[PDB]
Amino acid sequence: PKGNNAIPHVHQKKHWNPCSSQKGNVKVFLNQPAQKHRRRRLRLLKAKKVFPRP
Amino acid sequence: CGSRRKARRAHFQAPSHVRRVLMSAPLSKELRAKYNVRAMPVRKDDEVIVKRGTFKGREGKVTACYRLKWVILIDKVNREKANGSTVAVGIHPSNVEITKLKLTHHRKSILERKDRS
């Protein structure tokens, strides 16, 4: 019995969820710390290579 | 490996030249003092003595290192069958103890390589 709620506009009516029939359309961030580590390592190597230039 | 699955798979699918190293035995106090080496891979025609099991205390010469059943065979270690014929019993190399080495040129090279001094 919908009481006094807001009127929802959740916007999820396309095939975004991957299931047995759909590939999906999603993006997760589970590689965030690994990629951050990789970026820092690359920057340190590049500084070492181009030394003494800034 | 820090994975039990990977470690056990490597052990049980090891090739022959890896099983040779995996099947090693310690040396006596006399040989340890003489060569400064703690253990060597077992080889045919070595002299060993059994330190564990129901054949503990027996000494003999090695006649085979099967390497497919992970055992060595010793001539004095045997039992009887139903029909009265004799068969050999396999021991694991880490349960025995080398007391005399079959020495060759390459074997002495290996011992010099592994000398800890």
Binding site: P18, C19, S20, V26, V28, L30 | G2, R4
Partner: protein
């Protein structure tokens, strides 16, 4: 995403005297005409298959994290709370235990163990050693084969001098510049046993600030003010000022009637 659903099953309808569930198509095998596509069917699909966009991680307010670290540090200086958590501190000289800074020059584990025996942390180290065993349950199939208790933690001012202590089983090493709540309160229980080096002990005030002066590291952070000035309420309850106003004490089968 495709598991349990890799068949071309269809329902047979009614009229045939079988329940209306999708059934595998074809003939010639034992799987022909068997139920498919359902949590109730063998070989079927599970109810609500699990996804990788479940919320695995959590957000915590920075101030609440700092509050928790401060509270665990304060609890690690009351010798009864350490005992309740479970450490063996019966023959320990003092709590907090502060030790000279010359242990950072050790180079052999024999020297490290001699120092531990002199300080009398060896009782807790032995507790940890004797507790080691093989875990119960399925966990030992999943790279979690051994379990043991938690021993003392030794805090150093930097990352130098740990070579002698690194291999001792049952001793943990910490850096004062980055203290971890998961180590200061294992299991969620406060009262870890901590051995302080003198330099780290003198760095504590600059790292955490005081009740009036702010921290030089955690920008604009001061220790939280207490809700009670004196936490002993039984003394207040029994004091003379309260007893003068307490209310005075007072002094304290047939039924028929005919």
């Amino acid at each position: 995403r495709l598991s349990g659903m890799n068949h071309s099953a269809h329902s047979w309808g009614t009229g045939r005297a079988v329940a209306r569930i999708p059934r595998i198509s074809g003939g010639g095998t034992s799987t022909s005409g068997a139920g498919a596509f359902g949590n109730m069917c063998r070989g079927g699909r599970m109810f609500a298959p699990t996804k990788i966009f479940r919320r695995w991680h959590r957000k915590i307010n920075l101030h609440q994290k700092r509050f928790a670290v401060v509270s665990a540090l304060a609890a690690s200086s009351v010798p009864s709370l350490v005992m309740s958590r479970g450490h063996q501190i019966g023959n320990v000289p003092e709590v907090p235990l502060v030790v000279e800074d010359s242990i950072q020059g050790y180079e052999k584990t024999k020297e490290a163990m001699a120092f531990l025996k002199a300080i009398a942390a060896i009782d807790d180290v032995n507790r940890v050693n004797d507790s080691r065993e093989i875990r119960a349950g399925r966990g030992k199939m999943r790279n979690r084969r051994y379990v043991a208790r938690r021993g003392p933690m030794l805090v150093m001012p930097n990352n130098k001098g740990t070579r002698a202590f690194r291999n001792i089983f049952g001793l943990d090493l910490a850096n004062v510049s980055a203290l971890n709540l998961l180590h200061l309160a294992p299991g969620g229980h406060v009262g870890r046993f901590v051995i302080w080096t003198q330099s780290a002990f003198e760095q504590l005030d600059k790292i955490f600030g005081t009740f009036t002066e702010a921290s030089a590291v955690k920008k604009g952070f001061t220790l939280p003010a207490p809700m009670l000035t004196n936490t002993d309420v039984t003394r207040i309850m029994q004091s003379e000022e309260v007893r003068r106003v307490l209310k005075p004490k007072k002094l304290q089968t047939p039924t028929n009637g005919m």
